[PDB]
Design a binder for this molecule. Structure first.
Ligand SMILES: [Zn+2]
Length: 257
């Protein structure tokens, strides 16, 4: 029962998941002055044209927008990656206040939220096998700041009322995740982990430098979700983020100068 409260938050997770104190945990602070431009990084390729979204689920920790990954319909390639990674879901982490909510930080700056587009390496055949491998997943991370509304986010915001509590799901077809990307695909990359239990060290992180802007009203609706199940005492789904973890023996590489 790991979670985000005082008694079961991130600082407690290591008791159930000893890898929480491992050598390649995420998120991390991205020190922009220490990251190294890597001329070898090939360009990043986000091919979401045939993306097939299916459902949106409140899983008690965030909400997940799930995709049909039974075929290469929406994939991530290039950049630091070898091979083809299939989109399986995206989710966010966000704060109680506009000054916090992101998992990664940039020169210790926290953003209001962070989008994770989760992809698995097709050479491992399924998601469950992929998470057991050091190069199993590629997660595209996108910062959110509060400013102008993001039109491509609004279809998500408007369905949240129907998945308020843990375990609720709703149909979420014909959603285009391209609407959540910033203009630039300049990124930072490093090897890390899932940022929730089981905290598996199976992720190539690709974090976009350019944030997207969402409106105050949009993030406010995120904060009206619930960690709890229906008919339970209400605990707002806020501050579902893990703080920065020790970089240890890792170098963050930049795709840009
Ligand atoms: Zn995440």
């Amino acid at each position: 029962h790991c979670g985000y409260g005082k008694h079961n938050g991130p600082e407690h997770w290591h008791k159930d998941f000893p890898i929480a104190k491992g050598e390649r945990q995420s998120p991390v602070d991205i020190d922009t002055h220490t990251a190294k431009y890597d001329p070898s990084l090939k360009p990043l390729s986000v091919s979401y044209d045939q993306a097939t979204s299916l459902r949106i689920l409140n899983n008690g920790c965030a909400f997940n927008v799930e995709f049909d990954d039974s075929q290469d319909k929406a994939v991530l390639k290039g950049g630091p990656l070898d091979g083809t990674y299939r989109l399986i879901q995206f989710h966010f982490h966000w704060g109680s206040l506009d000054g916090q909510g992101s998992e990664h930080t940039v020169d210790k700056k926290k953003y209001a939220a962070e989008l994770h587009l989760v992809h698995w390496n097709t050479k491992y055949g399924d998601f469950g096998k992929a998470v057991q491998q050091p190069d199993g997943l590629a997660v595209l991370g996108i910062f959110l700041k509060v400013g102008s509304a993001k039109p491509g986010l609004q279809k998500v915001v408007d369905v949240l009322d129907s998945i308020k509590t843990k375990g609720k799901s709703a149909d979420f077809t014909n959603f285009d995740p391209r609407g959540l990307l910033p203009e630039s695909l300049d990124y930072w990359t490093y090897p890390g982990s899932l940022t929730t239990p089981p905290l598996l060290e199976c992720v190539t992180w690709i974090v976009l430098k350019e944030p997207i802007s969402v409106s105050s009203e949009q993030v406010l609706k995120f904060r009206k979700l619930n960690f709890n199940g229906e008919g339970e005492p209400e605990e707002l789904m806020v501050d579902n983020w893990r703080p920065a973890q020790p970089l240890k023996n890792r170098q963050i590489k930049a795709s840009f100068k």
